[PDB]
Ligand binder design. Structure first.
Ligand SMILES: COc1ccc(C2(c3cc(-c4cn(C)nc4C)[nH]n3)CC2)cc1
Ligand SMILES: [K+]
Ligand SMILES: [Mg+2]
Length: 220
């Protein structure tokens, strides 16, 4: 049975060129702009993502919610050699599409795709995937999971001082608990990046949250 996600991949494979991540991004955005809407794409958002990768030059990136691979392709194309992206996708068919998308784009050696739920996989990163700490986390999965998975990342020792969290859709449909927490906490230095959703004619935004280290115990 045909699916939207299969159609997106087919359109890339037909129209983009293998080993050219930019042609892949442009094919996805054209398709989602002209044929059918899809989650987790957008060049405008992608501009902001590019700037963060460019500025912080992360060597180890965790993505939550790969979907079809748009953001994984977007990020991995800007990674230095030896840098790596781990991306998590809870739906197995979407994981498969993300893998072929990345393969087509020629980025398969930079990315590891994990098929499972974030709260199950995150505490396995140290033991299973030889992670010390993450340089950057991109959150674009289930919105009610942004806050818990962030606390879970902290818990598991995966965050270091200077780790960049970048969270999408914090305005539409919104992640109010997450925003209140990271903005209200001294453990996160937060910058908001507005980005206009052109055809819904509404402002969304990303939140950048830089980890500052954990809250210190009471002293005297
Ligand atoms: C209904 O709104 C949606 C539906 C699907 C998604 C997507 C997603 C979410 C996850 C996920 C959830 N957990 C707990 N862990 C992981 C990993 N993977 N992929 C993007 C495809 C985003 C928003
Ligand atoms: K804060
Ligand atoms: Mg999204």
């Amino acid at each position: 049975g045909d699916t939207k996600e299969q159609r997106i991949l087919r359109y890339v494979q037909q129209n983009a060129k293998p080993g050219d991540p930019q042609s892949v991004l442009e094919a996805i955005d054209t398709y989602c702009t002209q044929k059918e809407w899809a989650m987790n794409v957008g060049d405008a958002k992608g501009q902001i993502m590019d700037a963060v990768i460019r500025e912080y030059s992360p060597s180890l990136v965790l993505e939550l919610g790969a979907y079809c691979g748009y953001s994984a392709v977007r990020m991995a194309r800007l990674l230095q050699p030896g840098a790596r992206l781990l991306t998590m996708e809870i739906n197995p068919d979407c994981a498969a599409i993300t893998q072929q998308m990345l393969n087509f784009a020629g980025l398969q050696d930079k990315v590891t795709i994990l098929n499972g739920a974030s709260q199950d996989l995150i505490p396995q990163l140290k033991k299973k995937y030889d992670v010390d700490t993450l340089d950057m986390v991109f959150l674009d999965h289930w919105k009610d999971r942004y806050l818990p998975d962030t606390l879970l990342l902290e818990k598991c020792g995966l965050l270091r001082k200077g780790t960049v969290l970048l969270a999408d859709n914090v305005i539409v449909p919104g992640t109010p608990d997450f925003l209140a927490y990271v903005r209200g906490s001294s453990s996160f230095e937060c910058t908001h990046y507005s980005s206009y959703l052109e055809y819904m004619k509404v402002v969304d935004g990303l939140e950048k949250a830089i980890y500052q280290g954990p809250s210190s115990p009471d002293k005297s």
